[PDB]
From a paper:
Here, activity screening of a metagenomic library created from rumen fluid led us to the isolation of a novel β-glycosidase, [name], which was assigned to the [name] family. Activity was confirmed for 18 substrates that revealed that [name] is a [name] member with clear β-glucosidase and β-xylosidase activities, but also possessing β-galactosidase, β-fucosidase, α-arabinofuranosidase, and α-arabinopyranosidase activities at low level in this order. Structural analysis illustrates the permuted domain composition of [name] that is composed of an N-terminal (α/β)6-sandwich domain, followed by the FnIII domain, and the (α/β)8 barrel domain. The active site of [name] is located at the molecular surface, at the interface between the (α/β)8 barrel domain, which provides the nucleophile Asp-709 and the (α/β)6-sandwich domain, contributing to the Glu-143 acid/base catalyst.
Numbering used by the authors: 5 to 798
The structure:
């Protein structure tokens, strides 16, 4: 028996919120002074956005603590009740629009028009104005660069200008899933500006902590903020529902801006400020070429007047060589403990060379299909953000080092022009374009040459999955018991809301027939989502902060701590697989689902994902990394084709997922609704077999996205081509209404009959599923050695 202490869960989430808010500007108006009266503007104050919309935004809760309630509960300030009542009375006639069905909730709410009388009267009886701008986000559509979406509405702009005129102290808070336009806000020029993201059901509590100074803000931006949407390198090749060419290649986010267009940046990657000031002093530097590491030290000192944390960020500048390189790539970071005024902390990091290697997808280095360090000078930088990072040390290689030999995989099927760094006389870099080489992989031959060996069936075998778990028999001996019906059944997830598992969840898998359950294969339960359990029964669960807020902490430990509670909460609800982390790269600011992902940077992306997974693993629960890979746009997501180079895949898009496997111990992946390099991801052999298993060494399961399409290359997509799915080693079709009855009328057995699917391929998937299933808490329930959870302190 293990106690889930609900108050400690709350405190853990609250800590994430108070570390994840990002202070952008402040003239001393924050923190709020003890005893201040605050006037809160913005009708969204009454309906705090705790999450985005969609699959990862449907956690049921008894109560949400918004910003006004958080401030009142702090006992540090009071709120102007007259103004609150004006908003309340207006909202009775202008109700919050919840939408009508899936994806229909608008991503902002109409703002209340303000008069000089209301704003003047508020100023007369309060000390400071707080203006809350609210945006939400979600599945199936992207932000438009228009009023009410990425830009302020006319009525919001009016609100901001009136407040600015009447109040000498003005704070702006952005209660947003993803970043919005800051140009007009910056021109209006409030005294302080803070991004507060969407903090889950206790978001107001953690936000009050930072506003009142109980906690000194320490969050940092996980994306670059440029002046215009058209400045982002992906914008030219983003938003087409049919096909988008990833022409920017490795030059995503700060990899582009710092290299080519520094002056287009308003706020750099890793930027964030505090109520105190810090001094970063570069320290000792050594390199160990034989171990393929360097070790770098610095000291961070609090040089201002109040306690706080800061983040030391380390970057590498690789020599341009023949491939071309970004100016700087993030290779390590460390958030200090709370530092009192005048105190300091020494930070030391050891960085493997693989963190700043480049993938040679042309052969120009002499090592085609390898991660490499080209000969030349490597310079290391440390500082407060990528722009304000300064030389830590350097070392020089006289010859190329191959860090890993890989293969030609997931290569583009058509040529396109990509960006390429080009050196100028004055030392600057400019963009030129070059043709990306086209795949020459014989996919048919690759599958045949790597075909697994069939295990001869034996229906008299009475081995239980318990006998495999105990070590008594090999998985191969057990799996011989599965009939062709059992094999076709086990690759089908059942849902949504299968009766085999906790009501109102996403899927049951494994023990999805009477015959499979008789072999002690348990029904394993899957459920959304990254921000908490979605229970369509109406049952309540903990609603946690959004993904971008988590990543903005730059603090894997606080993330891991919070998800350690989620680990127990899952066991309490008998959910084995939480459908997160969502961890697609932030390729463009307008992507609708950015809120539940982490960053434009693959290292930060993988490191935050890994922290979440480590938390979930604490008591033997698990997450599912999604969406593998290159689901960076919502418009046209059932059909759109992402055309991308091997180098960009290897260094940027796959890299976070690689880290989740190798650092996070990830054992479950979800593929996408869309196409990567000319076929759907659920049937892609290179993605799900060559890269994931044979190169990275993943041991686990791969599942489709829910009712995803699958195809054979060049063939038509369908929702029942499970043969193509199994031929790729995508193990689980999510989902069918009735797995045992083959409710989707799938082609597993017909393709097996015709020799187009090999029994060995089905057996490989069945073994992946059973090996996964036997290590879950659902298996432990069958063995009577599960953890029983009791919730205390409600």
């Amino acid at each position: 028996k293990v106690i889930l202490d609900w108050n400690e869960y709350i405190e853990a989430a609250r800590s994430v919120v108070s570390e994840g808010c990002v202070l952008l500007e402040n003239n001393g108006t924050l923190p709020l002074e003890k005893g201040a009266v605050v006037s809160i503007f913005g009708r969204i104050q009454t309906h705090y956005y705790k999450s985005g919309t969609g699959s990862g935004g449907m956690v049921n809760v008894t109560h949400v603590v918004g910003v006004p309630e958080g401030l009142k509960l702090s006992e540090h300030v009071t709120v102007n009740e007259e103004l609150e009542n004006i908003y309340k009375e207006w909202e009775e006639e202008n109700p919050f629009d919840e939408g009508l069905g899936w994806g229909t909730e608008p991503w902002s709410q109409p703002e209340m028009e303000l008069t000089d009388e209301i704003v003047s009267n508020a100023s007369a009886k309060s000390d400071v104005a707080i203006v809350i701008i609210g945006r939400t986000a979600g599945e199936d559509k992207d932000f438009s660069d228009v009023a009410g979406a990425y830009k302020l509405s006319e009525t919001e702009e009016d609100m901001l200008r009136r407040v600015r005129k009447h109040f000498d102290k003005m704070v702006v808070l952005l209660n947003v899933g993803s970043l919005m336009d800051l140009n007009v806000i910056s021109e209006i020029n409030p005294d302080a500006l803070m991004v507060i993201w969407q903090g889950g059901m206790i978001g107001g509590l953690g936000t009050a902590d930072v506003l009142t100074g109980k906690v000194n803000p320490s969050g940092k931006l996980t994306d670059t903020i440029a002046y215009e949407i058209n400045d982002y390198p992906s914008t030219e090749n983003f938003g087409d529902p049919v096909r988008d060419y990833y022409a920017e290649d490795i030059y995503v986010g700060y990899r582009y801006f710092e290299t080519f267009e520094k002056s287009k940046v308003r706020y750099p990657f890793g930027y964030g400020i505090s109520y105190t000031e810090f001094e970063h002093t570069v320290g000792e530097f050594t390199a160990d070429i034989n171990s393929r590491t360097f070790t770098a030290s610095c000291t961070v000192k609090n040089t201002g007047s109040v306690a706080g944390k800061d983040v030391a960020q380390f970057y590498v500048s690789a020599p341009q060589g023949k491939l071309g390189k970004p100016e700087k790539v993030l290779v390590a970071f460390k958030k200090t403990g709370i530092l009192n005024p005048g105190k300091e902390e020494k930070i030391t990091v050891t960085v493997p060379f693989d963190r700043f290697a480049s993938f040679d997808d042309t052969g120009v280095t002499g090592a085609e299909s390898c991660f490499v360090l080209e000969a030349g000078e490597y310079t290391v930088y440390e500082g407060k953000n990528v722009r304000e990072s300064y030389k830590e040390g350097s070392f020089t290689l006289e010859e190329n080092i191959v860090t890993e030999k890989l293969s030609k995989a997931l290569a583009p099927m058509e040529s396109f022009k990509r960006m390429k760094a080009s050196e100028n006389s004055d030392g600057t870099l400019s963009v030129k374009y070059e043709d990306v080489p086209v795949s020459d992989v014989d996919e048919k031959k690759r599958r045949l040459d790597n075909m697994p060996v069939e295990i001869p069936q034996d229906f008299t075998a009475r081995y239980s999955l318990k006998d495999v778990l105990s070590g008594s028999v090999d998985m191969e001996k057990f799996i011989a018991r599965l009939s062709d019906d059992d094999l076709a059944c086990i690759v089908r997830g059942e849902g949504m809301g299968s009766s085999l598992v906790t009501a109102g969840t996403a899927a049951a898998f494994g023990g999805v027939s009477e015959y499979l359950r008789k072999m002690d294969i348990p029904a394993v339960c899957c459920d959304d989502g990254p921000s908490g359990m979605r229970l369509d029964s109406g049952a309540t669960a903990f609603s946690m902060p959004n993904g971008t807020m988590l990543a903005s902490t730059f603090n894997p430990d606080v993330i891991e701590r919070m998800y350690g509670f989620t680990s127990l909460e899952m066991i309490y609800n008998k959910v084995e697989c939480l459908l997160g982390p969502g961890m697609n790269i932030h390729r463009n600011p307008l992507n609708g689902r950015n809120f539940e992902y982490f960053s434009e940077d693959p290292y930060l992306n993988g490191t935050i994902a890994s922290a979440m997974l480590k938390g979930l693993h604490k008591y033997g629960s698990d997450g599912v990394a999604k969406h593998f890979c290159c689901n960076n746009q919502e418009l046209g997501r059932q059909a759109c084709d992402s055309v991308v180079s091997q180098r960009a895949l290897r260094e940027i898009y796959l890299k976070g997922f690689e880290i989740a496997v190798k650092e996070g111990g990830c054992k479950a992946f979800m593929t996408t609704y869309a196409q990567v390099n000319g076929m759907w991801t659920a049937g892609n052999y290179d993605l799900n077999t060559r890269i994931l298993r044979d190169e990275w060494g993943f041991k686990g399961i791969v599942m489709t996205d829910w009712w995803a399409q699958v195809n054979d290359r060049g063939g038509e997509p369908t929702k029942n081509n499970t043969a193509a799915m199994v031929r790729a080693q995508n193990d689980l079709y999510m989902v069918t209404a009735n797995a045992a009855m083959n409710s989707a009328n799938d082609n597993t057995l017909s393709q097996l009959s015709e020799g187009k699917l090999n029994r060995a391929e089905l057996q490989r998937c069945a073994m992946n599923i059973c090996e996964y299933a036997m290590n879950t808490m659902a298996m432990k329930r069958l063995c009577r050695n599960d953890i029983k959870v009791e919730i205390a302190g409600r």
